[PDB]
Amino acid sequence: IQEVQAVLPEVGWLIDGDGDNEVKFTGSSAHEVMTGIIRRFIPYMKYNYTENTIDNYLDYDDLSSWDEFEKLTEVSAFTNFDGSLKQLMDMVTARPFNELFFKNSEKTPGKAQLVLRKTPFNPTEWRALDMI
Amino acid sequence: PLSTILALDLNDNLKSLSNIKYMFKGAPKENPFGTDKDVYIDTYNLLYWLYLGEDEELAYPMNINYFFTEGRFFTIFGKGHKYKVDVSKFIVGDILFFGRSDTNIGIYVGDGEFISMMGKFPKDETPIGKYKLDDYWNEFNGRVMRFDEEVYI
Amino acid sequence: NNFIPQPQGLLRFLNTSFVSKFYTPQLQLSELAKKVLTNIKTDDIPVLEREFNDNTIIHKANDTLLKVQAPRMYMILQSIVLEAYAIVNCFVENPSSLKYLTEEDVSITRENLNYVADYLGNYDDYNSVVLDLRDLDLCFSAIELQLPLIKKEA
Amino acid sequence: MKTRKLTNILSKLIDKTMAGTSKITDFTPGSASRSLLEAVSLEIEQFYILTKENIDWGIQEGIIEAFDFQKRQSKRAYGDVTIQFYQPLDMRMYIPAGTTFTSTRQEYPQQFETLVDYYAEPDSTEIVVEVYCKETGVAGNVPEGTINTIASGSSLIRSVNNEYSFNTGTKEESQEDFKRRFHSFVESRGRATNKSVRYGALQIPDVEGVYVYEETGHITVFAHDRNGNLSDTLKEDIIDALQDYRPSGIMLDVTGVEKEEVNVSATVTISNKSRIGDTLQKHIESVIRSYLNNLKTSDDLIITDLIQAIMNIDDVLIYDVSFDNLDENIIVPPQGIIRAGEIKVELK
């Protein structure tokens, strides 16, 4: 949005990036950032379901990443000009070091799950995958 | 400490030191405390004479360049910030700077006061005196230093 | 010790006339216990600055007055933990410690484990510990059967 | 319903088994019948133990259900932070509730957030605001000077720091704590009693220390959190919730807290003459600090309790402890609370 001041009479906000639509997400790991990113917009995405919204049908939990090697992050909402949340989701993912995809929830049949985990090419993480 | 004892002694003797007079860059060769005759001394020379009485010598005339590289001081608060609430944490004997270009300095004493010479520029006849920090707080500049003798040389 | 640190409580616990109708002990230190115990006693080991997992068997033993009521059996438990702790270390790191453990050393730990398990049964304060040690009594027997076989493989 | 250890079961079993025949009496470890009967007795022993544990858990659960005195869940960590401006302020600027605070240190990545707004007064220079930790447990108890940044634009803010440590971050209450709380609850059913006002004022989850001083015609309540600082919101909540236990004909006041200071000097003779460096002394000072800071108003400094606390370390290491200054028990006044000042520990 280009032409919105959002001022107030003789009052103002101490944090910068206020009045304007700027939003900042901060976390020391991908699961901390991705939680804030998804949780920021998911509830308000409303639909005409007789029973809820996407948050009941998508768990988007049990996320992890390289917390020890990744410092604190200041990822900006508008890093991509009028892009989709998927475009902004890719930046948070930091591929190929972390693997993001949508797949059925075997642990909870009947509903889908958003997966965000460190790549399984590590030796112990490779053994952690279920064999078939 | 040395600096606190010297500041307390100066405070106690402040009313008897009316012989000392203010000037811009008074660097007399006579010690003010060892002479009943009046003498024009500035704040830097005053501190030099006050510290010279004991075993410490420092250097002469002890201009602003002294604090930069001699390693006799360590800064407590930097220049360019000015908080009124953190004045209470100060201690007696801390040097207080004044002016935008380090024109004058002072010695802090408790109860929110400081010891310095203030007067018109062209060699004022006003003697040394103690003033409240409230009116001079505008021109404080936030720079504060402290002394250390044990480790030096 | 070479790879990762260990909890402070376990380091502190490890450095230090009843009869059963089925069992008798002998207080042999296993050869691997003999050399690992010296390292624990020395300061050359990393250690952690905080403790968690309060459900472990170590805190259970600490909470009960077994130290003052039966210091003999408290000693045997330390011996059980000393052998049991060492045989966990070699598989996960430092394989060079192998060919220093024999099935006889591992066998007598069950003797000592059941010789204390009967004693623990006489005072049902220690039930939480009893429950734990019985789970390990079948664990060691598997290692005894595989230890001569594993040693030749490695 | 009683324990029966494995060998007792196994013996009863074999004793019964041998009745009516004598073609079985060979029970060496190699025998398979012995192994089967050992396994059956192992399972029966485990059954008895789990039964007894489940009985205890049922007792606890019924105690929960009957009086509706549910166990306290995980308790959030919170405290105070200082915002520092580049210059004194030029307008009545404002912080909204739910502003984030993050520590730049990699060893404490936990975040914090505010719950109530604040306005900064014009021409002010600092402000103290309360921050609540999203995570709950031990991770909220960060050390001093941990929260460095606000994790936002911070245009008019230079740096943020905390002068005190977080102590309210605690894990879930154990069985023993719940039993103590419940025994005070059972003894607090009669109102107009000091033991009743104890529970009366302890019912708020955040309160940890609490003491009540009485006189001829007035009642006073002294309470604080683990940090040891009373808040006006807590006082209001206490007044609101405590109406059902307040004495009818006697006034009540909830206020009054002071930090009593004492310097502890001890001498420790380690059994190992080697390894007597200041690193272990740092650990011992940190343990003493954690012990002294944990006390409350109702507790008082005792020499023997301190000796027990510090001697939790294995007696093989520390062989002797003595105090050079402390020779008598110190009695804390009701309003004040004893805590660690500046501690000095040395070998000899």
Dump the DSSP string for D77-134. Answer: -EEEEEEEESS--SS--EE-TT-EEE---TT---EEE--S-EEPPTT--EEEEEEEES
CB D310 within 8 A of CB D285: no
Asked if D152 lies within 8 A of A15 by C-beta distance, the reply is yes
Q: After which residues is chain C broken (C to N over 2.5 A)?
A: 16
From the CB coordinates, do chains D and A have 3 or more pairs under 8 Å? Answer: yes
- How far D6 CA sits from the closest chain C CA (Å)? 8
Pairing of strands D118-119, D111-113: unpaired
Task: Give how far Cα D174 sits from Cα of D76, D178, D179, Å.
Answer: 17, 6, 9
Give the three-state DSSP class for B144: strand
Cis peptide before A96 (omega within 30 of 0): yes
Resolution in A: 4.5
Place of tokens 């909830």: D254
The count of CB pairs under 8 A between chains C and D is 42
CA distance C108 to C27: 9
Pairing of strands D219-224, D252-254: parallel
Asked if D156 lies within 8 A of A72 by C-beta distance, the reply is no
- How far D132 CA sits from the closest chain A CA (Å)? 16
- In A, which residues are within 8 Å of D95 by CB distance? 13-15
Chain A nearest-CA residue for D135: A32
CB B119 within 8 A of CB B3: no
CB-nearest partner of D49 from C15, C50, C131: C131
CA distance C143 to C107: 9
Among C113, C131, C136, most D C-beta atoms within 10 A, so best to mutate, is: C131
CB-nearest partner of D7 from C15, C22, C124: C22
Q: CB burial class (10 A; 0-12, 13-18, 19+) of residue D166?
A: buried
- How far D46 CA sits from the closest chain C CA (Å)? 7
Residue C29 DSSP symbol: P
Q: Where are the alpha helices (DSSP H) in chain B?
A: 2-13, 43-52, 66-69, 133-136
Residues 6+ apart with CB under 8 A from A89: A34, A37, A100
Phi, psi angle pair for D159, to nearest 5°: -150, 160
Q: Name the token pair of A17.
A: 């990036």
Among A8, A11, A14, most D C-beta atoms within 10 A, so best to mutate, is: A14
Place of tokens 């580049």: D86
CA nearest D37: which of D18, D2, D9?
D9
CA distance D73 to D171: 8
CB D211 within 8 A of CB D298: yes
Residues 6+ apart with CB under 8 A from D158: B81, D84, D85, D86
- How far A31 CA sits from the closest chain D CA (Å)? 12
Method for this entry = cryo-EM
